């Protein structure tokens, strides 16, 4: 991926137009690289959202509402 990106950014020095196969290889490698380091954030409760009676917020927890902000 690094090599293909460098080649794409450097070919202009020698005034050479890249061929479609090199472009396809570069974009495929870049897609793999971005796939490797992908993280999907997870949303959290608002903070004033109630916590139901089923959670036993008397003795099991003190939370009447979610903190949900951090």
């Amino acid at each position: 991926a690094v090599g293909y990106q460098l080649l794409l950014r450097m070919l202009s020095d020698y005034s050479l137009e890249p061929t479609p196969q090199v472009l396809s290889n570069a974009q495929r490698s870049y897609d793999a690289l971005m796939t490797d380091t992908l993280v999907v954030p997870s949303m959290r409760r608002r903070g004033d959202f109630p916590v139901g009676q089923g959670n036993k917020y008397d003795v099991f927890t003190s939370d009447r509402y979610y903190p949900g902000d951090l």
């Binding site: 927890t61 003190s62 939370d63 009447r64 903190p67 902000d69 951090l70």
Partner: protein, 53 residues
């Protein structure tokens, strides 16, 4: 107060010094502050610790 006494065959107290009256004092003062303080991020504090108890 405390006092002393003179012993004489006849009670001539003519030249002997009589008990003098001196008053004392006992002062009380104030000390320093007993201070304990904390700082924190309130959302992290309220993660599982409510009412700040």
């Amino acid at each position: 107060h405390q006092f002393s006494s003179l012993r004489t065959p006849t009670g001539d107290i003519s030249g002997q010094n009589k008990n003098n009256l001196i008053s004392g004092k006992a002062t009380g003062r104030v000390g320093n502050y007993i201070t304990v303080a904390v700082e924190y991020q309130q959302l992290e504090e309220a993660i599982k610790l409510n009412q700040l108890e």
